Amino acid sequence: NYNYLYRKPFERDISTPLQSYG
Amino acid sequence: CTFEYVSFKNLREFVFKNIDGYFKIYSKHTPINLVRDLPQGFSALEPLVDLPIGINITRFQTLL
């Protein structure tokens, strides 16, 4: 399923570099 | 866009800091006698808010 993906403490960053799992 | 929240004679003081993905705000309010610079004296600021936002702040700007 291509909808689930990966690229400081509790930091979040949506900038772009991203890959789905298989 | 993953977060939203709602809630010269006067000196308004604030502190803003970000630690471990939490963004903290503090404040104090007082009357003042001379407006030319910050008044020499003491009165500690107390917390307002402690937000869960996880953002990497490196720059800031002010609105009026």
Side-chain angles (χ1 to χ4, degrees), chain A residues 1 3-4 6-7 9-10 12-14 17-22, chain B residues 1-9 11-17 19-63:
Chain A
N1 185 353
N3 290 279
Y4 295 95
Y6 63 90
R7 201 179 305 285
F10 306 138
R12 189 158 65 245
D13 182 4
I14 64 171
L18 304 180
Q19 292 79 20
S20 80
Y21 298 107
Chain B
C1 185
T2 60
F3 182 94
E4 187 179 329
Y5 177 89
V6 177
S7 292
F8 279 36
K9 299 184 180 181
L11 173 64
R12 304 186 176 190
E13 307 196 57
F14 305 93
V15 165
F16 316 133
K17 71 179 192 180
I19 296 182
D20 303 341
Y22 289 87
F23 179 71
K24 286 174 162 60
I25 300 186
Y26 307 72
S27 76
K28 202 59 164 173
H29 306 294
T30 180
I32 60 162
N33 186 31
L34 176 61
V35 301
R36 180 56 186 82
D37 59 2
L38 290 163
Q40 183 170 16
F42 194 91
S43 57
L45 286 60
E46 63 199 40
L48 294 183
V49 179
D50 186 9
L51 298 175
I53 61 178
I55 287 175
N56 178 35
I57 298 168
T58 60
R59 294 176 182 134
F60 94 98
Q61 185 170 27
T62 296
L63 309 179

Coordinates of all heavy atoms in Angstrom, one line a residue, unseen atoms left out:
Chain A
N1 N 0.8 -1.2 0.0 CA 0.0 0.0 0.0 C 0.9 1.3 0.0 O 1.6 1.6 1.0 CB -1.0 -0.1 1.2 CG -2.0 1.1 1.3 OD1 -1.9 2.0 0.5 ND2 -2.9 1.0 2.2
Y2 N 0.8 2.1 -1.1 CA 1.6 3.3 -1.3 C 1.3 4.5 -0.4 O 2.0 5.4 -0.4 CB 1.5 3.6 -2.8
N3 N 0.1 4.4 0.3 CA -0.3 5.6 1.1 C 0.5 5.9 2.4 O 0.4 7.0 2.9 CB -1.8 5.4 1.4 CG -2.7 5.5 0.2 OD1 -3.0 6.6 -0.2 ND2 -3.1 4.5 -0.4
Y4 N 1.3 4.9 2.9 CA 2.1 5.0 4.1 C 3.5 5.2 3.8 O 4.1 4.5 2.9 CB 1.9 3.8 5.0 CG 0.4 3.6 5.5 CD1 -0.5 2.8 4.8 CD2 0.0 4.2 6.7 CE1 -1.8 2.6 5.3 CE2 -1.3 4.0 7.2 CZ -2.2 3.2 6.5 OH -3.4 3.0 7.0
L5 N 4.2 6.2 4.4 CA 5.5 6.7 3.9 C 6.4 7.3 5.0 O 5.9 7.7 6.1 CB 5.2 7.8 2.9
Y6 N 7.7 7.4 4.7 CA 8.8 7.8 5.5 C 9.7 8.7 4.7 O 9.6 8.8 3.5 CB 9.5 6.6 6.1 CG 10.2 5.7 5.1 CD1 11.5 5.9 4.7 CD2 9.4 4.7 4.4 CE1 12.1 5.1 3.6 CE2 10.0 3.9 3.4 CZ 11.3 4.1 3.0 OH 11.9 3.4 2.0
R7 N 10.6 9.4 5.4 CA 11.5 10.4 4.8 C 12.5 9.8 3.8 O 13.6 9.3 4.3 CB 12.1 11.4 5.8 CG 12.5 12.7 5.2 CD 13.1 13.7 6.2 NE 12.1 13.9 7.4 CZ 11.0 14.7 7.4 NH1 10.6 15.4 6.4 NH2 10.3 14.7 8.4
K8 N 14.9 16.5 16.1 CA 14.8 16.8 17.5 C 13.6 16.2 18.2 O 12.6 15.8 17.5 CB 14.7 18.3 17.7
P9 N 13.5 16.0 19.5 CA 12.4 15.3 20.2 C 11.1 16.0 20.0 O 10.9 17.2 20.1 CB 12.8 15.4 21.7 CG 14.3 15.5 21.7 CD 14.6 16.3 20.5
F10 N 10.1 15.1 19.6 CA 8.7 15.6 19.2 C 8.7 16.7 18.1 O 7.7 17.4 18.0 CB 7.9 15.9 20.4 CG 7.8 14.9 21.5 CD1 7.9 15.2 22.9 CD2 7.5 13.5 21.2 CE1 7.7 14.3 23.9 CE2 7.3 12.6 22.2 CZ 7.4 13.0 23.6
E11 N 9.7 16.8 17.3 CA 9.7 17.7 16.1 C 8.9 17.0 15.0 O 8.8 15.8 14.8 CB 11.1 18.0 15.7
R12 N 8.3 17.9 14.1 CA 7.6 17.4 12.9 C 8.0 18.3 11.7 O 8.1 19.5 11.9 CB 6.1 17.3 13.1 CG 5.3 16.7 11.9 CD 4.0 16.1 12.3 NE 3.0 17.1 12.8 CZ 2.5 17.2 14.0 NH1 2.8 16.5 15.0 NH2 1.6 18.1 14.2
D13 N 8.2 17.7 10.5 CA 8.7 18.4 9.3 C 8.1 17.8 8.1 O 8.4 16.7 7.7 CB 10.2 18.4 9.3 CG 10.9 19.2 8.2 OD1 10.1 19.8 7.3 OD2 12.1 19.2 8.0
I14 N 7.3 18.6 7.4 CA 6.6 18.2 6.1 C 7.3 18.8 4.9 O 6.7 18.6 3.8 CB 5.1 18.6 6.2 CG1 4.9 20.2 6.3 CG2 4.4 17.9 7.4 CD1 3.4 20.6 6.2
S15 N 8.5 19.4 5.0 CA 9.2 19.9 3.8 C 9.8 18.8 3.0 O 10.0 17.7 3.4 CB 10.3 20.8 4.3
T16 N 10.2 19.1 1.7 CA 10.8 18.2 0.7 C 11.7 19.0 -0.3 O 11.4 20.1 -0.7 CB 9.7 17.5 0.0
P17 N 12.6 12.8 -1.6 CA 12.8 13.1 -0.2 C 11.9 12.3 0.7 O 12.2 12.0 1.9 CB 12.5 14.6 -0.1 CG 11.5 14.8 -1.3 CD 12.0 13.9 -2.4
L18 N 10.7 11.8 0.1 CA 9.8 10.9 0.8 C 9.7 9.6 0.0 O 9.7 9.6 -1.3 CB 8.4 11.5 0.9 CG 8.3 12.9 1.6 CD1 6.9 13.4 1.6 CD2 8.8 12.8 3.1
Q19 N 9.5 8.5 0.7 CA 9.3 7.1 0.0 C 8.2 6.4 0.7 O 8.0 6.4 2.0 CB 10.6 6.3 0.1 CG 11.7 6.9 -0.7 CD 12.5 8.1 -0.2 OE1 12.5 8.4 1.0 NE2 13.2 8.8 -1.0
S20 N 7.3 5.7 0.0 CA 6.3 4.8 0.6 C 7.0 3.5 1.1 O 8.0 3.1 0.6 CB 5.2 4.5 -0.3 OG 5.5 3.4 -1.3
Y21 N 6.4 2.9 2.1 CA 6.6 1.5 2.3 C 5.9 0.6 1.2 O 5.2 1.2 0.3 CB 6.0 1.1 3.7 CG 6.6 1.8 4.9 CD1 5.9 2.8 5.5 CD2 7.9 1.4 5.3 CE1 6.5 3.4 6.7 CE2 8.4 2.0 6.5 CZ 7.7 3.0 7.2 OH 8.2 3.6 8.3
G22 N 6.2 -0.7 1.2 CA 5.7 -1.6 0.2 C 4.8 -2.7 0.9 O 5.1 -3.9 0.8
Chain B
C1 N -0.4 23.3 8.9 CA -1.7 23.7 9.2 C -2.4 22.7 10.2 O -3.6 22.7 10.4 CB -2.5 24.0 7.9 SG -4.2 24.7 8.1
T2 N -1.6 21.8 10.8 CA -2.1 20.7 11.7 C -2.5 21.1 13.1 O -2.7 20.3 14.0 CB -1.1 19.5 11.7 OG1 0.2 19.8 12.1 CG2 -1.0 18.9 10.3
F3 N -2.5 22.4 13.4 CA -2.9 23.0 14.7 C -3.6 24.3 14.7 O -3.2 25.2 13.9 CB -1.6 23.0 15.6 CG -1.8 23.5 17.0 CD1 -2.0 22.5 18.0 CD2 -1.8 24.8 17.3 CE1 -2.3 23.0 19.3 CE2 -2.2 25.3 18.6 CZ -2.4 24.3 19.6
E4 N -4.5 24.6 15.6 CA -5.1 25.9 15.9 C -5.6 25.9 17.3 O -6.0 24.9 17.9 CB -6.3 26.1 14.9 CG -6.9 27.5 15.0 CD -8.0 27.7 13.9 OE1 -8.0 27.2 12.8 OE2 -8.9 28.5 14.2
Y5 N -5.7 27.1 17.9 CA -6.1 27.3 19.3 C -6.7 28.7 19.5 O -6.3 29.6 18.8 CB -4.9 27.0 20.2 CG -5.1 27.2 21.7 CD1 -5.5 26.2 22.5 CD2 -4.7 28.5 22.3 CE1 -5.6 26.4 23.9 CE2 -4.8 28.6 23.7 CZ -5.2 27.6 24.5 OH -5.3 27.8 25.8
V6 N -7.5 28.9 20.5 CA -8.2 30.2 20.8 C -8.3 30.3 22.3 O -8.4 29.4 23.1 CB -9.5 30.3 20.1 CG1 -10.3 31.6 20.4 CG2 -9.4 30.3 18.5
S7 N -8.4 31.6 22.9 CA -8.7 31.8 24.3 C -9.3 33.2 24.5 O -9.5 34.0 23.5 CB -7.4 31.7 25.1 OG -7.0 30.4 25.2
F8 N 1.8 55.0 26.1 CA 2.9 54.1 26.4 C 2.9 53.7 27.9 O 3.8 52.9 28.3 CB 4.3 54.8 26.1 CG 4.7 54.7 24.6 CD1 3.8 54.8 23.5 CD2 6.1 54.6 24.3 CE1 4.3 54.8 22.2 CE2 6.6 54.6 23.0 CZ 5.6 54.7 21.9
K9 N 1.9 54.1 28.7 CA 1.9 54.1 30.2 C 1.8 52.7 30.8 O 2.1 52.5 31.9 CB 0.7 54.9 30.7 CG 0.7 56.4 30.3 CD -0.4 57.1 30.9 CE -0.4 58.6 30.6 NZ -1.5 59.4 31.2
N10 N 1.4 51.7 30.0 CA 1.3 50.3 30.4 C 2.5 49.5 29.8 O 2.6 49.5 28.5 CB 0.0 49.7 30.0
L11 N 3.3 48.8 30.6 CA 4.3 47.9 30.1 C 3.7 46.4 30.1 O 3.3 45.9 31.1 CB 5.5 48.0 31.0 CG 6.7 47.0 30.7 CD1 7.3 47.1 29.3 CD2 7.8 47.1 31.7
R12 N 3.8 45.8 28.9 CA 3.4 44.4 28.7 C 4.7 43.6 28.5 O 5.5 44.0 27.6 CB 2.5 44.2 27.5 CG 1.2 45.1 27.6 CD 0.3 44.8 26.5 NE -1.0 45.5 26.6 CZ -2.1 45.3 25.9 NH1 -2.2 44.5 24.9 NH2 -3.2 46.0 26.1
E13 N 5.0 42.6 29.3 CA 6.2 41.8 29.2 C 5.8 40.4 28.8 O 4.8 39.9 29.3 CB 7.0 41.8 30.5 CG 7.4 43.1 31.0 CD 8.5 43.1 32.1 OE1 9.6 42.5 31.8 OE2 8.2 43.6 33.2
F14 N 6.6 39.7 28.0 CA 6.4 38.4 27.5 C 7.7 37.6 27.4 O 8.7 38.2 27.2 CB 5.7 38.3 26.2 CG 4.4 39.1 26.1 CD1 4.3 40.4 25.7 CD2 3.2 38.4 26.4 CE1 3.1 41.1 25.6 CE2 1.9 39.1 26.4 CZ 1.9 40.5 26.0
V15 N 7.6 36.3 27.5 CA 8.7 35.4 27.1 C 8.2 34.3 26.2 O 7.1 33.8 26.5 CB 9.4 34.8 28.3 CG1 10.3 33.6 27.9 CG2 10.3 35.8 29.0
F16 N 8.9 34.0 25.1 CA 8.5 33.0 24.1 C 9.7 32.0 24.1 O 10.8 32.4 23.8 CB 8.2 33.6 22.8 CG 7.4 34.8 22.8 CD1 7.8 35.9 22.0 CD2 6.2 34.9 23.5 CE1 7.0 37.1 22.0 CE2 5.4 36.0 23.5 CZ 5.8 37.2 22.7
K17 N 9.5 30.7 24.2 CA 10.6 29.7 24.0 C 10.0 28.3 23.5 O 8.9 28.0 23.8 CB 11.5 29.5 25.3 CG 10.8 28.9 26.5 CD 11.7 28.7 27.7 CE 11.1 27.8 28.8 NZ 12.0 27.6 30.0
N18 N 10.9 27.6 22.8 CA 10.5 26.3 22.3 C 11.5 25.2 22.8 O 12.7 25.3 22.5 CB 10.5 26.3 20.8
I19 N 11.0 24.2 23.5 CA 11.8 23.1 24.1 C 11.1 21.8 23.9 O 9.9 21.7 24.2 CB 12.2 23.4 25.6 CG1 13.0 24.7 25.7 CG2 12.9 22.2 26.2 CD1 13.5 25.0 27.2
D20 N 11.8 20.7 23.4 CA 11.3 19.4 23.2 C 10.0 19.3 22.5 O 9.1 18.6 22.9 CB 11.3 18.6 24.6 CG 12.7 18.5 25.3 OD1 13.7 18.7 24.6 OD2 12.7 18.2 26.5
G21 N 9.8 20.1 21.5 CA 8.6 20.2 20.7 C 7.4 20.9 21.3 O 6.4 21.1 20.6
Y22 N 7.6 21.5 22.5 CA 6.5 22.3 23.2 C 6.9 23.8 23.1 O 8.1 24.1 23.5 CB 6.3 21.8 24.6 CG 5.5 20.5 24.7 CD1 6.2 19.3 24.7 CD2 4.1 20.5 24.8 CE1 5.6 18.1 24.7 CE2 3.4 19.3 24.8 CZ 4.1 18.1 24.8 OH 3.5 16.9 24.8
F23 N 6.0 24.6 22.7 CA 6.2 26.1 22.6 C 5.5 26.8 23.8 O 4.3 26.8 23.9 CB 5.8 26.5 21.2 CG 6.0 28.0 21.0 CD1 7.2 28.6 20.9 CD2 4.8 28.8 20.9 CE1 7.4 30.0 20.7 CE2 5.0 30.2 20.7 CZ 6.3 30.8 20.6
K24 N 6.3 27.5 24.6 CA 5.8 28.1 25.9 C 5.7 29.6 25.8 O 6.6 30.2 25.2 CB 6.8 27.7 27.0 CG 6.6 26.2 27.4 CD 7.7 25.8 28.4 CE 7.4 24.5 29.2 NZ 7.1 23.3 28.3
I25 N 4.7 30.2 26.4 CA 4.5 31.6 26.5 C 4.3 32.0 28.0 O 3.6 31.3 28.7 CB 3.4 32.1 25.6 CG1 3.7 31.7 24.1 CG2 3.1 33.6 25.8 CD1 2.7 32.3 23.1
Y26 N 4.9 33.1 28.4 CA 4.7 33.7 29.7 C 4.4 35.2 29.6 O 4.6 35.8 28.6 CB 6.0 33.6 30.6 CG 6.6 32.2 30.7 CD1 7.2 31.6 29.6 CD2 6.6 31.5 31.9 CE1 7.8 30.3 29.7 CE2 7.1 30.2 32.0 CZ 7.7 29.6 30.9 OH 8.3 28.4 31.0
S27 N 3.9 35.8 30.7 CA 3.6 37.3 30.6 C 3.6 38.0 32.0 O 3.6 37.3 33.0 CB 2.3 37.6 29.9 OG 1.2 37.3 30.7
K28 N 3.7 39.3 32.0 CA 3.3 40.2 33.1 C 2.8 41.5 32.6 O 3.2 42.0 31.5 CB 4.6 40.4 34.0 CG 4.3 40.8 35.4 CD 3.4 39.8 36.2 CE 3.5 40.0 37.7 NZ 2.5 39.2 38.4
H29 N 2.0 42.2 33.3 CA 1.5 43.6 33.0 C 1.7 44.5 34.2 O 1.5 44.2 35.3 CB 0.1 43.6 32.6 CG -0.3 42.6 31.4 ND1 0.2 42.7 30.1 CD2 -1.1 41.5 31.5 CE1 -0.3 41.7 29.5 NE2 -1.1 40.9 30.3
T30 N 2.2 45.8 33.9 CA 2.3 46.8 35.0 C 2.2 48.2 34.4 O 2.6 48.5 33.3 CB 3.7 46.7 35.7 OG1 3.9 47.6 36.7 CG2 4.9 46.8 34.8
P31 N 1.6 49.2 35.2 CA 1.9 50.6 34.9 C 3.3 51.0 35.0 O 4.1 50.3 35.7 CB 1.0 51.4 35.9 CG 1.0 50.4 37.1 CD 1.0 49.0 36.5
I32 N 3.8 52.0 34.3 CA 5.2 52.6 34.4 C 5.2 54.1 34.5 O 4.2 54.8 34.0 CB 6.0 52.0 33.3 CG1 5.5 52.4 31.9 CG2 6.2 50.5 33.4 CD1 6.6 52.3 30.8
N33 N 6.2 54.7 35.1 CA 6.3 56.1 35.3 C 7.0 56.8 34.1 O 6.5 57.8 33.6 CB 7.1 56.3 36.6 CG 7.2 57.8 37.0 OD1 6.3 58.6 36.8 ND2 8.2 58.2 37.7
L34 N 8.2 56.3 33.7 CA 9.0 56.9 32.6 C 9.1 55.9 31.4 O 9.5 54.8 31.6 CB 10.4 57.3 33.2 CG 11.4 57.8 32.1 CD1 10.9 59.1 31.4 CD2 12.7 58.1 32.7
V35 N 8.6 56.4 30.3 CA 8.5 55.5 29.1 C 9.7 55.4 28.2 O 9.7 54.6 27.2 CB 7.2 56.0 28.2 CG1 6.0 56.0 29.0 CG2 7.4 57.4 27.6
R36 N 10.8 56.1 28.5 CA 12.0 56.2 27.6 C 12.8 54.9 27.5 O 13.5 54.8 26.5 CB 12.8 57.4 28.2 CG 14.1 57.7 27.4 CD 13.9 58.0 25.9 NE 15.2 58.1 25.2 CZ 16.0 57.1 24.8 NH1 15.7 55.8 24.9 NH2 17.1 57.4 24.1
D37 N 12.7 54.0 28.5 CA 13.4 52.7 28.5 C 12.7 51.8 29.4 O 11.8 52.2 30.2 CB 14.9 52.9 28.8 CG 15.3 53.5 30.1 OD1 14.5 53.9 30.9 OD2 16.5 53.7 30.3
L38 N 13.1 50.5 29.4 CA 12.5 49.5 30.4 C 12.8 49.9 31.8 O 14.0 50.3 32.1 CB 13.2 48.1 30.1 CG 12.7 47.5 28.8 CD1 13.6 46.3 28.4 CD2 11.3 46.9 29.0
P39 N 11.9 49.9 32.7 CA 12.0 50.4 34.1 C 12.9 49.5 34.9 O 12.7 48.3 35.0 CB 10.6 50.5 34.7 CG 9.9 49.3 33.9 CD 10.5 49.4 32.6
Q40 N 13.9 50.1 35.6 CA 14.8 49.4 36.5 C 14.0 49.0 37.8 O 13.6 49.8 38.5 CB 16.0 50.3 36.8 CG 17.0 49.6 37.7 CD 18.3 50.4 37.9 OE1 18.5 51.6 37.6 NE2 19.4 49.8 38.4
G41 N 13.9 47.7 37.9 CA 13.1 47.0 39.0 C 12.8 45.6 38.7 O 13.5 45.0 37.8
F42 N 12.0 44.9 39.5 CA 11.7 43.5 39.4 C 10.3 43.1 39.6 O 9.6 43.6 40.5 CB 12.6 42.7 40.4 CG 12.7 41.3 40.1 CD1 13.7 40.7 39.2 CD2 11.7 40.4 40.6 CE1 13.7 39.4 38.9 CE2 11.7 39.1 40.2 CZ 12.7 38.5 39.4
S43 N 9.7 42.2 38.7 CA 8.4 41.6 38.8 C 8.3 40.4 37.8 O 8.3 40.6 36.6 CB 7.3 42.6 38.5 OG 7.5 43.2 37.2
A44 N 8.4 39.2 38.3 CA 8.5 38.0 37.5 C 7.3 37.7 36.6 O 6.2 37.9 37.0 CB 8.9 36.8 38.4
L45 N 7.5 37.2 35.4 CA 6.5 36.8 34.5 C 6.0 35.4 34.8 O 6.7 34.5 35.3 CB 7.1 36.7 33.0 CG 7.3 38.1 32.3 CD1 8.3 39.0 33.0 CD2 7.8 37.8 30.9
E46 N 4.7 35.1 34.6 CA 4.0 33.8 34.9 C 3.5 33.2 33.6 O 3.1 33.9 32.6 CB 2.9 34.1 35.9 CG 1.8 35.1 35.4 CD 1.0 35.7 36.5 OE1 1.6 36.1 37.6 OE2 -0.2 35.9 36.4
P47 N 3.4 31.8 33.5 CA 3.0 31.2 32.3 C 1.6 31.5 31.9 O 0.7 31.6 32.7 CB 3.3 29.7 32.6 CG 3.1 29.6 34.1 CD 3.7 30.9 34.6
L48 N 1.4 31.6 30.5 CA 0.1 31.6 29.9 C -0.3 30.3 29.3 O -1.4 29.8 29.5 CB 0.0 32.7 28.9 CG 0.2 34.2 29.4 CD1 0.0 35.1 28.2 CD2 -0.9 34.5 30.4
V49 N 0.6 29.7 28.5 CA 0.3 28.6 27.5 C 1.6 27.8 27.3 O 2.7 28.3 27.4 CB -0.2 29.3 26.2 CG1 -0.5 28.2 25.2 CG2 -1.5 30.1 26.3
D50 N 1.4 26.5 26.9 CA 2.4 25.5 26.7 C 2.0 24.6 25.5 O 1.5 23.5 25.7 CB 2.6 24.8 28.0 CG 3.8 23.8 28.0 OD1 4.6 23.8 27.1 OD2 4.0 23.1 29.1
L51 N 2.2 25.0 24.3 CA 1.6 24.4 23.1 C 2.3 23.2 22.6 O 3.6 23.2 22.5 CB 1.5 25.5 22.0 CG 0.6 26.7 22.3 CD1 0.7 27.7 21.2 CD2 -0.8 26.2 22.5
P52 N 1.7 22.2 22.0 CA 2.2 20.9 21.6 C 2.8 20.8 20.2 O 2.8 19.7 19.6 CB 1.1 19.9 21.8 CG -0.1 20.7 21.4 CD 0.2 22.1 22.0
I53 N 3.1 21.9 19.6 CA 3.1 22.1 18.1 C 4.3 21.4 17.3 O 4.1 21.2 16.1 CB 3.0 23.6 17.7 CG1 4.2 24.4 18.2 CG2 1.6 24.1 18.1 CD1 4.1 25.9 17.8
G54 N 5.5 21.2 17.9 CA 6.6 20.5 17.3 C 7.3 21.2 16.1 O 8.0 20.6 15.4
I55 N 7.1 22.5 16.0 CA 7.7 23.3 14.9 C 9.2 23.8 15.2 O 9.5 24.0 16.4 CB 6.8 24.5 14.5 CG1 5.6 24.0 13.8 CG2 7.5 25.6 13.7 CD1 4.5 25.0 13.4
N56 N 10.0 23.8 14.2 CA 11.4 24.3 14.3 C 11.4 25.9 14.1 O 11.7 26.3 13.0 CB 12.2 23.6 13.3 CG 13.7 24.0 13.2 OD1 14.2 24.4 14.2 ND2 14.2 24.0 12.0
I57 N 11.2 26.7 15.1 CA 11.3 28.1 15.0 C 12.8 28.5 15.0 O 13.5 28.2 15.9 CB 10.6 28.8 16.2 CG1 9.1 28.5 16.2 CG2 10.8 30.3 16.2 CD1 8.4 28.9 17.6
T58 N 13.1 29.4 14.0 CA 14.5 30.0 13.9 C 14.4 31.5 13.7 O 15.4 32.2 14.0 CB 15.3 29.4 12.8 OG1 14.7 29.5 11.6 CG2 15.6 27.9 13.1
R59 N 13.3 32.1 13.3 CA 13.0 33.5 13.0 C 11.6 33.9 13.5 O 10.7 33.0 13.5 CB 13.1 33.8 11.5 CG 14.5 33.6 10.9 CD 14.4 33.8 9.4 NE 15.7 33.5 8.7 CZ 16.0 32.8 7.6 NH1 15.1 32.1 7.0 NH2 17.2 32.8 7.1
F60 N 11.4 35.2 13.8 CA 10.1 35.7 14.2 C 9.8 37.2 13.7 O 10.8 37.8 13.3 CB 9.9 35.5 15.7 CG 10.2 36.7 16.6 CD1 9.3 37.6 17.0 CD2 11.6 36.8 17.0 CE1 9.6 38.6 17.9 CE2 11.9 37.9 17.9 CZ 10.9 38.8 18.3
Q61 N 8.6 37.6 13.7 CA 8.2 38.9 13.2 C 7.0 39.4 14.1 O 6.3 38.6 14.6 CB 7.9 38.9 11.7 CG 7.5 40.2 11.0 CD 7.4 40.1 9.5 OE1 7.2 39.0 8.9 NE2 7.7 41.2 8.8
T62 N 6.7 40.7 14.1 CA 5.6 41.3 15.0 C 4.6 42.1 14.1 O 4.9 42.6 13.1 CB 6.3 42.2 16.0 OG1 7.0 41.4 16.9 CG2 5.3 42.9 16.9
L63 N 3.4 42.1 14.6 CA 2.2 42.7 13.9 C 1.6 43.8 14.7 O 1.5 43.8 16.0 CB 1.1 41.6 13.7 CG 1.6 40.3 13.1 CD1 0.4 39.3 13.0 CD2 2.1 40.5 11.7
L64 N 1.1 44.9 14.1 CA 0.4 46.0 14.7 C -0.6 46.6 13.7 O -0.9 46.1 12.6 CB 1.4 47.0 15.0

